Amino acid sequence: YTDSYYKGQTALHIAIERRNMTLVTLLVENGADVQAAANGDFFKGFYFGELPLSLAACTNQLAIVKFLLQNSWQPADISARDSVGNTVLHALVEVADNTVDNTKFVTSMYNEILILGAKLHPTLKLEEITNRKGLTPLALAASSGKIGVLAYILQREIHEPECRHLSRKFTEWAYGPVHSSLYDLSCIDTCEKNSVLEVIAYSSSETPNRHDMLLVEPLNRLLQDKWDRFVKRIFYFNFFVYCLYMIIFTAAAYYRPVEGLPPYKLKNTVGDYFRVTGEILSVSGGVYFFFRGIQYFLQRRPSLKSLFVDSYSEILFFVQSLFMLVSVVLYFSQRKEYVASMVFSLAMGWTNMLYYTRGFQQMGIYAVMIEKMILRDLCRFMFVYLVFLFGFSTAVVTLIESYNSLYSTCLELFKFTIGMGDLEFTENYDFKAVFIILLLAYVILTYILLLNMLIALMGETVNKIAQESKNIWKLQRAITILDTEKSFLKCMRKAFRSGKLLQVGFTPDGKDDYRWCFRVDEVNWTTW
Amino acid sequence: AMGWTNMLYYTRGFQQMGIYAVMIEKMILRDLCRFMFVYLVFLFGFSTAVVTLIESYNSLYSTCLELFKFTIGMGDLEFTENYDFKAVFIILLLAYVILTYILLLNMLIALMGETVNKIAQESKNIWKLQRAITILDTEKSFLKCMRKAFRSGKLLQVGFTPDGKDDYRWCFRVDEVNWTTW
Amino acid sequence: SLAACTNQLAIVKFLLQNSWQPADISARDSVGNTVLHALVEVADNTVDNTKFVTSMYNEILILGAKLHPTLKLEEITNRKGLTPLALAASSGKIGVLAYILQREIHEPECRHLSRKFTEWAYGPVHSSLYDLSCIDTCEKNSVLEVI
Amino acid sequence: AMGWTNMLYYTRGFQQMGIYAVMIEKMILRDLCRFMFVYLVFLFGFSTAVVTLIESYNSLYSTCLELFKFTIGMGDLEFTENYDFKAVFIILLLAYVILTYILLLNMLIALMGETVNKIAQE
Ligand SMILES: NN1C(=O)C(=O)N=NC1=S
Ligand SMILES: NN1C(=O)C(=O)N=NC1=S
Ligand SMILES: NN1C(=O)C(=O)N=NC1=S
């Protein structure tokens, strides 16, 4: 019994796996070691925690955990950490897969484990234990997308004495049908190591339900309050600054001189001075955006795949900055091709003006719809339409013989999609029937069918991504809020939440429980 | 040209593009066919009317082309002056435009929207069927002298047949997780 | 077959193992469709009909194994050379196909008629062995080829 | 002209025409407004780009009109020859056409379909 497929597993593990309770006691009373962690590669098969206690807990055998934790024979270490370091709570967070029954099971098992740990060790905060990756169970749930466990923890309410301090949702004055809940923000806004909001907003883009998690009551209200308190003013100021900068860029570029020698001497004139000032401002903004892109690439450390997956705004801004920098280089390199670069950072730049629509609910949802449509439907349609257009342009140009060039024929065929095809644009075909048949078939296939098909696909898509688009907009707002909070450039400390409140003031040690609670009112009209 | 269109046949292997191709097939089969029937009816009727009324554009082919150019949004609306009855020709062109361009094309759009709204899972199933056909064609004809078409190795299902012999079958292994009571 | 397809399982039970005159479960008519082929044909994918045909096929298979443990009844081919699973595939009997491809019987002396066999299932994770006998390549006509 | 538009105000008395007018109001309020915002963004950006690249069409107004003519399906696609960089101007016009005409207009259509599908009783 030395192979890795069933390595480490002992008689106690087999007894726990068989749902047998008397046999487990018979084994334990003999002297069985409950700390013989199973380090087999089969138990990273399925990975339950690599300990008999975690194995019992994750299989819904609460009785076995109850016996092991407080057995009179050999103590069971609730805080035991395996090779990966994931303790019992981390194992429960990992095993859960958001299923309703599994969600209820993990919620109940986590609650019972926490209660028992407090009972044995009232002075120990079990949930604060960190694995080898430095992620707390709440943080681990946030990273892995365990929405059910996240919702339970953020709404963990326990009324029993000696177990209240483990909760986060604490009731307040509730004389009548209106009650205010204090949601604990401990490590939900800033844990100083890694907060829930940071993990959710700065995820790796592969989390199954990164969008939905922010719908959790406390998190959604916290982010909305942050937006409505101070972030709104700063974001609108940034929007205005961007508009001013881009109008400056448009004025400077539009009034560029037509003369040669791209490096133009600064003639003594007020208008020329204004143009030079505008160019300097535009280049400074481009350098700032380039440095912003570099900073975001270095800090967030994208996985080399999230760049094109969930970070388009930063990518577009960085590419516009690259275009500006290449334009400046060509301007100082005696190359008149700088226009070809400059003009690309102008038009594209105005498109990025859609990035400042994240702050407005309707316009942000519109931008999210634009993103999704371009990603899926516009991409598929462009694939198929390019196939058809290249095929029929090649056919026509082979049949045609000034329009014998492939480029001209492709342009003429594309003009049919914008409803401008001549249908008789040439007379060199020499086979009128064949050319006419080709053009007619192309028109019916692409203009009549493919475009209307794109319309229908987009209608069906918007009919099925409404709430998804709203969730993505809220996620974008969360990302912007966190970026402003971490980087603000105004020397302000208004990122703090509702003042510290005396939750209970009677900790298990008798000390005072002070936590950065957040207050949410609500009204209940039934029986109260 | 037709050849490049068949390049859509190699989209069966990609789920999204295969489903798009299946939607294209279904739309062309049903909605594009019905629309072409009705639109050809209308276009032939109104082209015959105009060409009877017109008299270089007195040919049926030229009038049909000019009327079809309205569907691609290029109809002149005054492409001739030989009609000799401006009111009648104008009424004919207006009626054709409202019947076909405004109504029939938007109708094709609405029909296609309703169709895509009701053949999503059907399109996915047809894509999977096409993938199955391609898989079987490759398996039977491979042109590479390979024997990797076999499935998960023979497994001793029980080993105790009613005759007491060994039951060896080419079983295939599928894992799953049950979180209720187990 | 007439009794089996009309949901009169008691009549089949009596006829198959009557003490008076043996009833040939493998009997083939002019078309050659045996009892299982008849059950596959009669079914029309209806929920109640699907349950009826599933139960009747399971009982017929169990009784045939009981009488003739050494005989694979399902392997009998009609005049067209289509097995009951193959016949269901050809005729589009989705319910019967799903039942056969998931026919799981835990009872001893009747396990070898199944196709879905459980494997190591110590906890909440279990792996099923789906039999691919004549599902990928039967050498005569496989389910995938027919579909 | 505006006056004749107010002739829609006397459609309140007819159930079908009144509901049509209400749909017109809601669509103009929400979907037409959002689409105009985004389309003006795109059109101003690409008109500024083209007019910076172009040099009789060097005026901003003429370039904006020529680009807007693509939305009514009348864009020339070769309306000038002063760009001096055919590749860049062609890329700009193509990108604008795909972004606005193909996508944004069809997007407005889809948004309006979804909106009418949800404001019938309203
Ligand atoms: N394009 N072309 C010619 O140039 C010709 O001379 N004869 N046939 C054809 S199709
Ligand atoms: N087309 N046509 C003529 O050519 C004419 O001479 N008088 N009336 C008509 S409509
Ligand atoms: N517009 N323009 C000019 O007028 C010129 O002379 N050289 N390049 C460009 S882009």
From Swiss-Prot, chain C:
It is found in: Postsynaptic cell membrane; Cell projection, Dendritic spine membrane; Cell membrane. Phosphorylation by CAMKII seems to regulate binding to vanilloids. Phosphorylated and modulated by PRKCE, PRKCM and probably PRKCZ. Dephosphorylation by calcineurin seems to lead to receptor desensitization and phosphorylation by CAMKII recovers activity. ANK repeats lie at residues 1-24, 33-69, 83-106. Predominantly expressed in trigeminal and dorsal root sensory ganglia. Expressed also in hippocampus, cortex, cerebellum, olfactory bulb, mesencephalon and hindbrain. High expression in the cell bodies and dendrites of neurons in the hippocampus and in the cortex. In the brain detected also in astrocytes and pericytes (at protein level). Isoform 1 and isoform 3 are expressed in brain and peripheral blood mononuclear cells. The modification Phosphothreonine is found at residue 118. Non-selective calcium permeant cation channel involved in detection of noxious chemical and thermal stimuli. Seems to mediate proton influx and may be involved in intracellular acidosis in nociceptive neurons. Involved in mediation of inflammatory pain and hyperalgesia. Sensitized by a phosphatidylinositol second messenger system activated by receptor tyrosine kinases, which involves PKC isozymes and PCL. Activation by vanilloids, like capsaicin, and temperatures higher than 42 degrees Celsius. Homotetramer. Interacts with PIRT. May also form a heteromeric channel with TRPV3. Interacts with CALM, PRKCM and CSK. Interacts with PRKCG and NTRK1, probably by forming a trimeric complex. Interacts with the Scolopendra mutilans RhTx toxin. Interacts with the spider Tau-theraphotoxin-Hs1a. Interacts with TMEM100. Interacts with PACS2. Belongs to the transient receptor (TC 1.A.4) family. TrpV subfamily. TRPV1 sub-subfamily. The association domain (AD) is necessary for self-association. Responses evoked by capsaicin, but not by low pH and heat, can be antagonized by capsazepine. This is Transient receptor potential cation channel subfamily V member 1. The lineage of its organism: Eukaryota, Metazoa, Chordata, Craniata, Vertebrata. The chain holds residues 253 to 399 of 838 of the full protein.
